[model samples]
Target chain A: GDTSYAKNSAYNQLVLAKVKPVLEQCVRELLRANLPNINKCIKVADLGCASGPNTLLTVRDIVQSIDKVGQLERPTIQIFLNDLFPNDFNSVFKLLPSFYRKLEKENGRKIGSCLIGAMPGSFYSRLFPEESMHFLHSCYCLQWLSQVPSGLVTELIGTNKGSIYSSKASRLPVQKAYLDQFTKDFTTFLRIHSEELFSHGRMLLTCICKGVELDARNAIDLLEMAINDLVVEGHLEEEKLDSFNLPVYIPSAEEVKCIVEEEGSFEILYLETFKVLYDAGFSHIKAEYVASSVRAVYEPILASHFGEAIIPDIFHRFAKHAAKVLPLGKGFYNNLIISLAKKP
Target chain B: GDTSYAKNSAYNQLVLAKVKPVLEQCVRELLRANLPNINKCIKVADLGCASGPNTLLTVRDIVQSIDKVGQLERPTIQIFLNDLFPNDFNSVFKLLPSFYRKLEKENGRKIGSCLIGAMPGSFYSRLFPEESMHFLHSCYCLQWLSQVPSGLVTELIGTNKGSIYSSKASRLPVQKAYLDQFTKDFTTFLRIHSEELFSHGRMLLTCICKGVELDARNAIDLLEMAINDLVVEGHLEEEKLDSFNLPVYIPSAEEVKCIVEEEGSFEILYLETFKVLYDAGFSHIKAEYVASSVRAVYEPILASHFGEAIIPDIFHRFAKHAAKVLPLGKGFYNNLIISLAKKP
Candidate 1:
């Protein structure tokens, strides 16, 4: 995946700043409430940790919170950054030196040993020793899948593809099919990892989400809106809209809760939605910076619709449209944060 | 004396709370700048410490500041709450137990041995042992004297009345004569106590003062305003205005500096004036708890002005007037703080 897109996205920057206060407050409260529990040495994992900037920021807060309880006598902290093999673990590893330096500046040499290592594998498989990790956090990396499930596309073929753009048409069958696949994948992912987590371990997950009822037609319609805007601006042909499809399912808070409850192993800690707005007037290069971590997902789609020559114009146009529609003052966009618990 | 009048004043309360932050800051600065001297187990006094609240409050700050520098050991803190014998010290003594308890709670048992004792005497005369005291702090109590200077009063031959309020104006000579008397008394008082102060001891003096060229007419006008209001309310006869004399002669800041400088041994640390609005009307007594402290100074004046029968009515009327004149939204009054030096 073009990890640079996620690393540099303006939308991510805004979201990070907005949530920084919440993260700080949450960690402080957790430390105060669970000081006795925190005193014990524990291993923490940042699964799907991209480039590690956000993960390191959280680690700093957690360490500071623990310090307030009193001195930790050589407490052991194991930070496991897990991702797929294709993900750029090299870049994440390179950022650790400076992060350690920053910590040293704040607390001198009093801070205990913090061991950093990586696990390269699929999240659906067991990635750690049983009953090892004490805490887990992940953000924005769950939505991508290798391919769409075959059963959903087979059902879609007879459903009048051309009429899929109509607002009145129900997309429930397609949405259900997508959700079913997500449920299967996610359940296996959790069960495989549950044995790796210690008792009372916490997991905080953040991802893009939607509140509206999921429909294949609405999903297509929303995609069409973006394609139509690009075509009308002479960046792409109108016919290209038919081939474009969003690979990710943006689950609502209720849908996510249902899936987690059905899985039965993990307890839900907190779940809430937030909005993020990004302007679209940025250059292709700047937009790539904005979507640094996700560029691989977006670049191929852009190249397929508009030739490489038009890619720059398409990005500029999309950025401009995004800027106008999602002006900072509007404060729109929807995402959700869910903190979960897995008992021993 | 109209003792009831002083009971309802905000002057004392304003002096009490407003001085806290300033005194705290000053003590912190002093501790930071002169830690070695302060650490050497020294004696301290708050001369003319009326009511003792402000004095002890300052003591708390000073002790706390010293503790920050790791000098929390037994420092002989001889807090001499000196004042005129006739002045009410009962209320001040009553508050001691609570103050001691607060100190004990914050600093533990070592604080109890610091030695807090009150000296009930006049600042105008000798009060302490020679070369014994290290720090002296006095606020708002230096102006009172036993009597007006003889030269200030003219002998009315026919009525046999020694008239200080007589028609021979330019009471400049008379005021000067009184000031000279104050100078003589103050000089002797300082001389007698000079042997009491340890080498390099510090003294802070804060009081109300007027400019050298301050209009006497304005001074008389304020007094007249008070008398006229009393007369109109049937509390006093109109003739009382003619007979009334304000014993106070608010010296200019420069005059105070000159007096201290002329006294020869003490050095000036800081001197600045701040204006304070005393609500001529006794309005602050509405709050039942505040009434007790409010009545501390005003009770005598009110008793003299209106006998027991009309004291309540007097308070009500005064409160009404005070509500109209004072900038009560802010604090009722403003005053100045002057820090001085008493070096052996």
Candidate 2:
């Protein structure tokens, strides 16, 4: 309630900044390949664009790239910013006039008329007409499975207890269930997008991937511990803590490759896994900031399950735990960036 | 601030209801003439859809009409809801899941997948790709000029003093200036939409139109009186009220006909004028209720120009003024409905 993703998304913005070069390169390659006979309109979409400052980052990068390569062919761009229904699209809509103003301001001329629109829906579902979109971009969103994996709650109790994700210590069945859900969700995502993307349209996707076992354990284990402490303090029930598993999967690079090949509508143009450290510019990244950042991203999901009453205490405990784990040097995000083209 | 357009747009909804048959008939005629070679995607748009209950009222009607006509040739429908940048799009977006659910619930089978998006900008600008939209709609919006006429404040003082619109008693220049702005705005609207809409594509437009001089004078004169009362009580400057001519034009049917012909891009197929009375079902519509309704629609525009602090007092005075004046039978809205096709 207090913190917002827009203010706390500096970490995510950093991830996008690191991924921007790849996005720009992808746009350039796509344009170079397709720009000779470019259509009058370049339809682009940023799926899973949260209501935050980073919402327009990807679109701006692509527009800037389009300007560089589009010598005389200043194709009018129609960009669609998409998120789930509950997202604050009005906040994003409010940013449109300035987005246009800044684009023209930075470019020193009107590059082309940009029509920005917001599509409210899930990317797992079809959000565009067949072969309508040319360039699609998504960042820090693919890991969100449509819903938490089925059977997380077994017989009115959680099978994956004491943790929100499929950690290394989780049972084989819990592990399999999480993987199965991610697999199915990713396949549906690719299949539906394949239909919506035009021939040779490029997609640049970035998400936190599965890093080493210990790294994943430290980050989520602290969150799990905070919730478990709340359960111990009588603020929340044991069953409530147990039943609440995150509908998220940090897929490995291998998993991404396998899904792309299995789905068979796209060819991976480029794929890379890299670590985004918290100490990028700062000498010491404050543990409280990290905790607040995590809270900003997860508070909505957390409060949806656990009552909003416990958020303050939980995040306070999270900041304490994050301080203890700060020096472990495994506090960085393992991000995966992939560029794919729709197979003709 | 107290009343919302969603709650107070009942009268507008009534006008929409009275005009629904024309919309249905327009859709049928368009589909029958075009469905034989109908494109796989049917692109439709509702421009100036305020964030209110009536926002999706037009879309739902269009979708229902499409479902009836698009049996085997079930084209995937893409609907774009448009409004000015400040409209509350998130509220409109929040209604989407239920909108989709009801669409499928009403028709046993899922009618072709519908992609709903929000485009936030003035419709005076180009909002779509060239020849992309197949059906365009706008209601209670064309009357809104892009900006107030430039000459309203020649010496930093109000020109059309004590009134909001071109009341019959206004100076000739004030009246002519308003008409010229409307002519320019309406032409821009028609010309831009002509480029966006495909050849022979149909458009259904409805707006509150000018009726007899007495009716226009009575409706807005009461509002002007309320603000003038506020000024006399030292609540507002007289010049501010004078300079605050509404950027709205109640175009007569003759003006609309002339614009369509002069624009030379659209052929008018259906044109009609009608009256919607407040006493349709209720014995007597309360003046307070009518005041609140007008406040809901005009508050944002009013507050933007006049300070937000005076909204309560001005509207309170408006209610007092409305009580005495509404008993005269001229309180009804004069509505104009027109259907046009982009010339082949």
Candidate 3:
């Protein structure tokens, strides 16, 4: 009965697996630099950790790496799973007993004992106490702006007119508004997180970055095409389509670096731009799987804007469009992982 | 569309208001005794803090008390709202923006900043790092056993028969089972929380205790009558009624004191028994309100045992029975508050 993010998160699971090495390295670096017999528990947080089966993947990676780094005589690890207020954390929590059992069973209880707690809030705000957190991890969520650039609501509503985001067809002002919002939002995020973290605290973040990969752009294009079809068929008002735009930004690595420097609180330790193949393991990708994944992520916002009644039809159209584009689809994600530490 | 604890929480709100003095006192004691330029922020937790409009009530009290105690150049206070995994924390979190706003609006910026995080877990487990918390508070939740006493499931099935708990008519073995479970659960709670609280840290806990007030007893009696009626009328099976029992226990103040002594980590600073009027502010109590309040707490568990289809009918019967008992009803709760400090 639940519209479960855990069930629809195969792609996210793949992404976590793909970036496991980077995440492990980040934890290893944090452990060696910070764990000087000074702390009772190493506090870590996964920001924007939407529900499981992938919710604990990063925690597991961190714990396993820490195991390699220090059995530290098995230091206590307190992990906070953070997401927005409305995230389905109950689903994530339902997995805990088994998670603890598995950890204890496989590791013989010598691995650092892990305590996982759900933290519901926005990352843009100060989520932890000052200097409370030692490490933070956020994956695939930074592209979302704090709000649909207020400019879009106040002055630029029809500027992005036919497109849902800073699409290829979007005007320069529309693109600039998104970029501005991202810079403002990302800067606040860094600042707030810096205050929450202890000096020399670490953060590992992965987000969509502007590049040649047509995956996100292609999906949005299809969604726009589907919405346009609805307008043409008189199923939705043209005004409705014109008024809608996603609060998302795809920034280049340069743009992110610029924001970090401007923010001046965190020093970049590792930064890399990478591409993940849609069919990383499989010989081919299924259009339906792609559509379902997108639907799982976007359906709530889409239904809120368009009526919920039109969701099945919209997704049906999206799947068709996706099938049409798959023959030409190469690799999907233009993603980047930036690891940083609070400046001393 | 949601079964909202927030909406059905008026009675809990009244209880919180009733206990505000003790909560404030607990905070005042914690601040003066612990705050000696020792740390950056005061970390506090409210265990079993189910959702709001009353959720932030304790936090508000603590923050205001800290402000009175601290004006300590406006120290940062970190609060953790702890509850079971399935507790509706999202509802509590939805009120944060306004909560922060009200604090800022009423007290001005010098009121000491407040940072709140939702911590989902059980009180029986270790919910925080060793000595991480300076103060902890739990109200109306300690009576809940970690699990139904195994004796009830294994040896005592059908021993209590139609009674849902250790009722006046229940056998001695049934009463002992519930008592044993409470002692075990409460002992574990103290032991785990003792580890969580720093030396000289304070805790204030309020829970149902055995007393002269027939409110809870009468409610259970009426509930048992209602269930018996359902069985007699062929709406439920006798076996089902016999098997279903609440994992709840009402402990005597002496019993609680004994546990604290046996646990040996916390020294009781204050302990008192008090009765809260069922109609607190209202001129008279309504049977419907009583039924609804009880329903809000028990419906999930009841529906799990009895099918959801029978809820309305059962509640209707329960309300009628409550009406019959209301005329004879006096005060409602036999509750106690015990304030303790972690021994140095």
- In terms of TM-score, the best-performing candidate is 2
- Give one digit per residue, the lDDT tens place, for model 1 in B1-344: 23443333355556655555556555555554453345544456677755534556656755664455454454434354565544444455455556767877877634333445444445665455445456677776665554545443453311212222322242455556657666776676566566556655566666656532223222223333444566776776555444434344455677677777888887666666665445332444433323333445444554564455654554444454444444443223234676655564
Give lDDT tens digits, candidate 3, residues B254-344: 9999999999999999898887645454452377677776777788888998889888787788877777655665536678889999998
Identify the superior model by DockQ, candidate 1 or candidate 2: 2
Q: Rank the candidates by lDDT, best first.
A: 2, 3, 1
TM-score of each: 0.42, 0.93, 0.87
Candidate 1 A-chain TM?
0.75
Query: For model 3, what share of native contacts is present?
Result: 0.52
Best by lDDT: 2
* DockQ head-to-head 1 vs 3, winner: 3
In candidate 1, what are the lDDT values of residues A1-344, reduced to their tens digit?
33344344455556565555555444444444442235444456667765535656656655554454453463445466666655555555456566766777885523224545455455665555555466666667666543454343644433323222223343665555567767787777667667666666666677666634332222223334445666677656655554444455666778778888888778876677876543332432432333232333466655654566655554444444333333333323467787666754
Measured with DockQ on alpha carbons, how good is candidate 2?
0.70
Clash counts for the predictions, in order: 52, 0, 1
lDDT (tens digit, per residue) of candidate 3 on A1-344? 34546566676767787678888888787876763332468888898888767777777877786677664367788888888877777677777777888899986553226788766678887777777788898999998889998788866277778778887567998888898899889999999899888888899999977766545445567788888888888888888888899988878889999999999999998898876544443442377677777787889889999889988888777777777766665426678899999988
**Model 1's DockQ score:** 0.00
